[PDB]
């Protein structure tokens with residue numbers, strides 16, 4: 329059975345998508361002084377029958393996700409009520425906004441250390457490892473879809489595609505799906521093939537973002553059209569394809585790992601179990 333929405337106090341808009349929007353909410357009566365804060369996804373004001381259907385399917389997907397580094401479904405609104413999904417409020421916002429504020433610690437004003445960058449990335453790899461065990465393909469992994477809680481805890485989400493802050497991250501063509509082409513493997517762009525291996529590619533790009541402290545867009549100086557043509561160069565494999573450059577905060581060893589994520593052949597990209605071990609262990613000696 330479900331959760332009574334009467335108990336919700338809407339406080340702030342956190343995200344906005346095709347059919348839904350997310351609000352910060354206060355739950356009236358976890359100390360007696362402080363209220364309980366949650367994030368609540370509800371239908372958009374322009375929602376229709378179609379929106380309700382998509383909402384019901386998202387509930388089905390979310391009810392499956394039970395991992396420390398994936399957002400969890402705390403509850404849904406009572407049957408009588410307008411549809412809602414409730415999850416934890418992640419108090420430090422999305423990872424892109426959070427990291428963007430910081431600079432890399434100067435070995436010789438918020439700063440963040442290289443080992444903390446590894447810790448962030450490792451948590452993302454752990455969440456993705458779990459999704460891989462469920463044979464669940466994310467399709468839109470990026471730092472804008474990761475959320476930051478207390479003590480640099482990271483949870484992967486998939487939301488807020490219509491956030492104005494990230495409008496430039498999506499390639500929109502009338503009559504087509506909205507596509508995050510700068511994060512997409514070449515076979516996603518060319519054939520629409522999304523797999524765990526293309527989630528690994530997107531993880532490589534997400535790792536690049538983290539090591540750039542989210543201060544630059546992948547392929548930022550190239551046009552959307554140039555990014556799409558680059559996928560063509562991966563397909564043709566005449567050595568004219570290009571890659572994201574090594575971030576200044578990224579040691580060559582870690583960069584080589586990212587390059588493996590962007591292997592032309594899907595089967596040659598590393599599994600998330602391997603990525604996680606590298607980021608949690610091997611990366612520490614560099």
Ligand SMILES: O=C(N[C@@H]1C[C@H]1c1ccccc1)c1cc(Cl)cc(COc2cnc3[nH]ccc3c2)c1
Pocket residue numbers: 342343350367368369386389390393398399413414415416417418419420421422466475484485486487
């Ligand atoms: O990702 C969601 N649903 C997708 C189906 C789930 C999924 C699919 C694939 C992979 C992973 C997850 C999702 C749902 C709900 Cl109710 C709420 C949210 C957003 O929540 C927060 C919380 N705190 C925040 N602070 C600042 C912003 C912010 C946003 C996102």
